Subunit: 120 residues, 4 copies
């Protein structure tokens, strides 16, 4: 409380580090599976979650530009943090690429990822 701050691991090797601020801020760095693969992460979480067995709602964005590379796209992850011995962040995500109007219908991928505090 909160157990969100720290390092989180996805199934296929992505890793992020985040600080959950007392004001509801999420800030950190996302590393897609060196610094060439590291991107700024910024989001928000419920800083006063229920203590009734529910998850803690959250979301964040990564725009896939850094000093080295730029995919002209951005992912947002929406989900909840589930605490305990096997804590997890369960998310669904949208990845939108910049497109022309003609190609806008195929601008956005949807998917899901779970993150854990230990490597899977």
């Amino acid at each position: 409380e909160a157990g969100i701050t720290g390092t989180w691991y996805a199934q296929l090797g992505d890793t992020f580090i985040v600080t959950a601020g007392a004001d509801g801020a999420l800030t950190g760095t996302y590393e897609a599976a060196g610094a060439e693969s590291r991107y700024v992460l910024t989001g928000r979480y419920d800083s006063a979650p229920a203590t009734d067995g529910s998850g803690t709602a959250l979301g964040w964005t990564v725009a896939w530009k850094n000093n080295y590379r730029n995919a002209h796209s951005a992912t947002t992850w929406s989900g909840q943090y589930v605490g305990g011995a096997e804590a997890r962040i369960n998310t669904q995500w949208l990845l939108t690429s910049g497109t022309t109007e003609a190609n806008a219908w195929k601008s956005t991928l949807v998917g899901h990822d779970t993150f854990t505090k230990v490597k899977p």
Copy 2:
């Protein structure tokens, strides 16, 4: 182009600032849902978009807690800014509520919002 006050199709107000760096900051006031007054938002955008007529990718998050209410929820919007005569931000969103594990299957709503610098209707 992104910095300014935007309105979605339902009348919600999105006041955003785009930093030189890729940062989005601002406030969101929803016209619908378990929400009242302004909420903080943060996000990111592509600060060096392509020069081929493509839009500018972006996204942001609102956690639906402020000094007055808490819905134990958060929405993320993912989309692109399209400049021109009439600038638009076209998005799809995910709204996740805290749930127990048994109810996690019904935790997340999906939708689509289009933002313009004029109020709707």
Copy 3:
């Protein structure tokens, strides 16, 4: 009287023709924007909708294979029918392409489309 049977037009050129069966069946053809561009459509709808002003829930699928082409992908539309002078079907959709596991993370596009009875 479901009001669904007939021809529907998407905002960007696509057309479909559907029959709403008394039992909840949707059956028809989707033409993408031309038999080369026509595909089988099948789905289901709520044949006894609420009478409180709510729309009529429905969904359908098109696999993008016909006798001429195969994109190795399928779209599902999930939405609701709203009747009246300006009847419409408001949908959100998921398009999944067959991929290897390594590429599964980019298998599925999401979007939305509204269909009307006039172009």
Copy 4:
């Protein structure tokens, strides 16, 4: 390999037949939600998939009305069949409820279900 009885991670039962012409037919019984007993499903699949190691694209719909209950809603699953050691159907789904116009923004739930021929 699609024809058969499948279960998702919640214990829902998906009984499906794949027709030579690309048709999917069968029944769905949900372990969760406003649902009782079997519901009719129909859908489509790619009857001539790639041979390059890709999965087989498919989708289906259930309207949540049967002779017992009506939830005024429909779910569509969009995904792919992955033949493997243990065969799997990986999906994402959209559940839309009939709503008034004022509530249309909250009409649609999204999630992801994985189906195997084994029940959890």
